[model samples]
Target: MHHHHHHGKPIPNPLLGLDSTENLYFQGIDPFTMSTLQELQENITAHEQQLVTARQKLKDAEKAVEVDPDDVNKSTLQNRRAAVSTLETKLGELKRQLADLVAAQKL
Candidate 1:
């Protein structure tokens, strides 16, 4: 047998302005919260996909630069390489936050 225990008071409802009573309802009646959860899940998925795509783009651009070291198109490849690098950095931070949220939710 297993028992579950809550460690602290529940989070207050933001829409209720700190008054918990305003959002109270019978069980199975809170679709709004469920929708928000779904949205967050979708956002995490989309960002993860984007991060993967950006990483692949970076790899391809690096290869292009290597293949055409002295070509006139090197500048274009370099610009793309820089853009992907920036994207990867930002995506890494976003991924960390998303992972934390997923871990916190145990999802």
Candidate 2:
């Protein structure tokens, strides 16, 4: 996980960055902290939406670039790829955590 902070060599895909981990709530919490099933489920839903939007943005950018290429297009594609990657990673984490919660609650 790209663990360095800002001022690091300008990330090739800056859009891949999500500095709001606390609010994002995609990762699993330790037993030290508790999370409700409903909350976790909502978190997963949010990331899923983000993933969908990110993919659409990438697709739109691709169509635009096809019409006329530019360096800006390169940046947009890079950023979109980064955002999509981050969203996918978060979505996976949220799903895993939610699955575990669902199983436990099944008890």
Candidate 3:
């Protein structure tokens, strides 16, 4: 039931292909090693787009907090601020993933 082709694994094949011999002669289920640079880039790009919107929304929240502090509840403002920080942390992690992909490509 577990039939997998040797050449059909999700291994990240570079433009020039593998430069060295590997002991991975028989891989079963797909592994994380099969992640591709393009897929990583795509994920990072999507996350970046998310951050952009998150930042925009934070700006709007800030505008409201500034223009009408009486109407903008303190808890709401703090929640928005915290959300942006969390999103920024997500962005940093994605950036690290991108860096790892680039390093793997360089090898």
Candidate 4:
């Protein structure tokens, strides 16, 4: 007969997953903090321009695929979509930074 009361190695909690120790948040220096307010506006405007271009590119890619569906065109559309999404996120961050600065300077 086998002994059922033998102590076994402790089992890790099944409900919890191992946590990542590495930090994934943006580590780069914010341009808003280092530059003059004048140039900051320019930087924000430049990103806006790029966002517009990316959006236009995505729209064109969608039209191209709609006109003639092909693997190449489909991949191009996906790339454009990713570009637009990234630009939008970046623009959002920049706008938020500007808002924060404006609020702080209003005192």
TM-score of 2: 0.60
Superposition error at 91 for model 3 (Å): 1.6
| 1-107: candidate 1 lDDT, tens digit per residue | 68887687776665755534676567435455546546766765675566577667667776777787666447666666666676667667766765666565543
lDDT (Cα, tens digit) per residue for candidate 3, span 1-107: 87866554576655895679766676455434436777777877777777787777777787777877765545566667677777789778877987877776655
TM-score of each: 0.44, 0.60, 0.54, 0.58
Candidate 1, residue 38: how far the Cα is off, in Å: 1.4
Number of the candidate with higher TM-score, 2 or 4: 2
State the lDDT of candidate 4 residue by residue for 1-107, as single tens digits. Answer: 86568567886876877776876575445555535555666778898899899989999999989999899898999899889888889879988877876675544
TM-score of 3: 0.54
Worst 10 residues of 3 by lDDT: 26-35
Give the winner by TM-score: 2
Whole-model alpha-carbon lDDT for candidate 1? 0.64
Candidate 2 collision pairs: 16-82
lDDT for each residue of candidate 2 in 1-107, tens digit (9 for 90 to 100): 96876555553765766556555446554552235787888888888888898999888788768877898886788789789999999988889997788887655
> Which of 3 and 4 is the better model by TM-score?
4
What ordering of candidates by TM-score runs from best to worst? 2, 4, 3, 1
Give the least accurate 10-residue stretch of model 2, judged by summed lDDT.
25-34
